[PDB]
Amino acid sequence: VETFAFQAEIAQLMSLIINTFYSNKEIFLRELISNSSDALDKIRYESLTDPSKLDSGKELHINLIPNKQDRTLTIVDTGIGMTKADLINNLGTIAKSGTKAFMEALQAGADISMIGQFGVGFYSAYLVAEKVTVITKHNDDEQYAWESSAGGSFTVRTDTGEPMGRGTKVILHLKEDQTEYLEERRIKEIVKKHSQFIGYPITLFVE
Template identity: 50%
Template structure:
């Protein structure tokens, strides 16, 4: 029998507190990139279990349909990002979320001083602090995760005040779920471009930043259809019937299958960064197409 770990409150290390303060007080202008960072983390988690399952199929627990799922909820003002990747144990959550490697943090703050010549995108991704970008748009972040083979999951929660709570919890499926309770500024209907509960805003951000992610990024849409009569014609006065439609938001289409003429410089750069897990733009790129047999 495993020992139950009760809920406890811990403090972030000093460097993490400083980073959270920077995120919360918004040094970054391009706040929408938080979604790109969290989806990139989810993709990495799936990469990891896919690789490790090559030598241990039991890790999959019967679930090999890898995907990332987004759930915007108007009632709770939350945006949820879920994956069925490798997940984390209790100790891994403390190590990976509660702290940041000091060497990486030091480099981050050194680069921050040179921000005039460094973009938001480079800073956040380059030093492995992408998870914390969620605090730019949230009042509270909740993480629920379970590693394969573990009886219990782990629930981590913080409102960015320098402390976090961590406890065991029940979680049926392996993987990680991040629930972002959005600040009021980021679910205002009057500003659809920064309303991260607006499904079409989310869809556009996925196409902009995460279209080349190798796994399907899915989200449900409410579809309204007018009832039809016996002749197949719409019944005008009848209330529309609502159905739920699950859509895949990213194309998962490699650049080499598309025409050179329809691609932009930004698409080449984003594809390179995602494929090779790099944060700098490529020095140069060449697009060529050849046909024949090998």
């Protein structure tokens, strides 16, 4: 288990998300699904010119898995996945994101729902989750587990639990008062409201 610090501005953004009063939390799901879609776009695109990249799974889809007993909502995709390095650079640093622009926007009148415009939508997970686990598998690396309850750090370790094939799985350990998002009709409502046009099957599992 390796423990890393978030880049300062990331930590600041996370704090903002966790601490700002903002009721319209449901947008977290849209942003996660949107990331999934992007990742699926990427493998689809690369696999045009190299079909062997599908050897780890041809089906391109997104699964939504609620679990009331564990109080978790899991979003799984069969997208391109992330290597260890992608994982650490993309989740722990500003990278190609508009972290700064977002935080500045928030001061100039913008609202949190616009987070996706700035390439940092993943962190909206922290509107509803006390902890977030990201399990990922890229064709070019082994399976890794990223994890963070915020507070300025995250961990990365190899994951030898259930091999995934290829893709990314985001496990949301929900806050106590956010169990709303484990309810079939609530989830259905949100997907219809915000993600009806996504170009990949979205399957909502039942319990």
